[PDB]
């Protein structure tokens with residue numbers, strides 16, 4: 005159950021590349037507790053499979069390096085995340101972000117694109133709803149639009165992930181449309197759910213006016229305000245918040261759509277590792293210092309949430325690892341994995357100090373990026389990068405001739421620290437996670 | 449509890465896809481033992497990363513199914529297997545079979561293509577060599593030619609994995625060549641190593657005659673006979689072997705090159721999931737029933753070896769998962785993974801009964817194959833397959849424009865069962881495995 009897993013010394017020497025300093029048995033035994041968890045922090049790396057973790061560690065920490073956050077969780081396993089074909093009820097081997105998020109948030113598999121409903125389109129209670137009912141404070145943070153599938157899945161039940169605001173819901177989710185007697189769009193359901201802390205992007209959908217209900221005629225932003233939400237839009241105002249609860253829930257909208265990525269780098273290109281020079285990532289100039297980082301949002305949320313005596317449930321998402329993978333941009337993708345790692349560190353620090361917090365880090369599904377040899381002549385998009393080791397690493401994206409690289413169906417890493425973390429070991433399913441969390445918090 | 453990880457019931461219903469029956473904590477706590485391992489069985493799936501495991505599970509057992517061998521090991525983790533650049537000593541992100549096998553068998557990183565030597569070309573003792581010196585019985589089994597990198601790394605120290613027999617060694621490993629005062633070719637060093645049980649293919653190199661030494665002029669096969677090796681060529685003859693020890697070592701040569709693969713299927717093709725119908729694998733008609741399977745070899749080895757009072761070390765390899773992956777042949781690859789699972793079952797059956805056996809299952813490195821959506825338009829080679837779920841699964845090979853798909857550098861799964869199995873949990877390095885085994889057995 006060690007906390008340092010970097011190579012011991014000279015990687016060219018016998019025992020120099022070892023990450024273990026001694027026998028794990030006793031330490032591992034010491035880290036196994038079935039006592040209840042008072043708090044739960046679930047961090048999700050959207051599209052962050054074992055390959056994405058390996059490529060980012062290699063680049064930012066070196067092959068023999070180690071992520072202080074991501075690599076430091078002691079109990080590890082692999083889990084399945086296949087979705088279901090809506091018509092046949094048969095497995096669909098490659099899930100989208102919607103079906104997987106619904107799986108761990110409700111405990112039931114579903115079809116790609118479904119948010120909070122099963123294949124029969126019937127609603128099921130999310131872990132956040134249950135937490136909130138039991139008295140626990142709740143948080144939902146992401147670097148994506150708050151309407152994005154992952155944060156959405158905890159607070160909305162729609163038949164199609166595209167039902168962002170009133171206008172799209174009427175056309176695509178008529179059965180959920182407010183005017184038609186439904187629960188409403190994702191954004192409307194988010195506002196109704198009222199998690200104590202909610203932070204991310206997606207301010208543009210809040211400019212839509214409701215078509216019905218008690219607040220028809222007013223923009224979703226006007227409604228938020230009208231219903232007691234504290235609205236912050238940058239790091240400064242985010243930091244000046246001193247409390248967030250059911251009387252004053254916090255809602256931060258730091259971007260119109262998705263928040264900007266941390267690093268800039270060119271897009272992989274065909275034979276890019278051969279015909280183009282190796283690249284070194286640089287900071288994204290389009291990203292203002294006023295836009296809080298994932299670690300900052302995570303830290304503020306933890307502070308506001310831990311004020312609750314009963315406990316809290318918090319979900320944090322590093323969204324753009326997935327987005328940059330789709331875009332075949334190694335620097336964008338790696339920068340986002342580094343960003344997530346910082347957030348994991350904040351979580352682990354609190355968890356170790358507090359002692360009754362279960363921390364889980366995993367991804368919703370695998371993705372395209374592969375690490376290949378320097379001289380690889382590949383059919384897809386490639387790019388050579390200068391790593392921290394002073395060596396060249398080539399990344400390949402070879403599963404799509406279209407303008408977006410695809411998710412993949414491989415089982416991937418799930419790691420945890422704290423009470424009930426043992427339930428993450430061995431092979432499990434993404435739906436087992438819902439139950440693991442439900443049982444750790446003693447939720448009925 | 450920890451033995452059954454199949455979906456519980458109806459995968460479309462809440463809790464239906466769950467693999468866990470209850471809380472793992474106490475069960476996991478019970479399996480943590482730091483007492484000495486009397487025996488060690490290391491099973492290697494060449495090129496068998498998490499993707500390959502998922503593809504084969506989905507196909508053979510369905511998405512919610514589970515491998516009775518491969519998926520039944522309770523302690524799991526992920527490990528790194530990067531090699532080293534010979535000139536610079538900097539990490540080489542994508543290893544080959546030779547550099548990786550050397551890392552787990554000697555405990556030191558090395559350059560791609562090296563067997564039993566570090567980047568300075570200095571020999572280091574293997575775990576088999578140390579087991580043999582300590583009085584334990586030793587076995588080396590593989591479905592590849594016995595000169596293949598993986599089995600070879602346990603008994604040979606050469607600067608190039610190409611140094612199969614006398615001729616190749618003369619021109620590629622002059623400093624190892626017998627005529628120039630070296631230890632000899634891989635096959636010669638193998639014969640010198642004298643493990644109690646050695647089973648595999650690669651009979652063609654044994655037809656070579658030694659150039660120098662005590663047996664110059666005689667084929668290596670005759671030399672084998674001259675030194676007291678019992679030679680078997682088929683299942684019937686293997687089965688009649690009563691004992692195998694230092695005075696009557698067993699040498700099984702089941703094929704000229706690599707042993708034949710179990711399943712047959714066409715090679716993936718460009719837009720194959722689109723232009724060609726789904727395929728269903730069938731048994732290989734060219735495979736002679738007289739050729740033993742990996743589980744039959746594994747089983748017999750365990751039977752001969754366990755006769756040794758002190759203990760035994762046995763390495764088992766399913767080589768063709770890798771070869772078929774290079775060849776972009778889904779059915780060949782999956783069938784070899786199914787073949788390995790049966791061997792893992794035989795090992796675990798013995799281990800659970802015996803009680804002092806550490807069983808480890810992992811791969812040397814990751815590979816090319818990805819599971820993609822049915823409608824994917826990929827730039828590489830694809831193929832649709834009809835799974836056990838009656839659903840279509842598409843596999844993609846998109847990292848090479850050559851006639852061979854390439855390895856990938858992603859960290860991958862390592863799972864174990866038995867005394868000291870906790871040393872496989874969390875993030876480790878492929879070289880840590882060497883130390884885990886040496887420690888479990890109490891070597892040095």
Ligand SMILES: [Zn+2]
Nearest residue numbers: 050051101368
């Ligand atoms: Zn996703």
Ligand SMILES: [Zn+2]
Nearest residue numbers: 051326330411
């Ligand atoms: Zn995606």
Ligand SMILES: [Zn+2]
Nearest residue numbers: 494495545812
């Ligand atoms: Zn290999």
Ligand SMILES: [Zn+2]
Nearest residue numbers: 495770771774
């Ligand atoms: Zn290979």
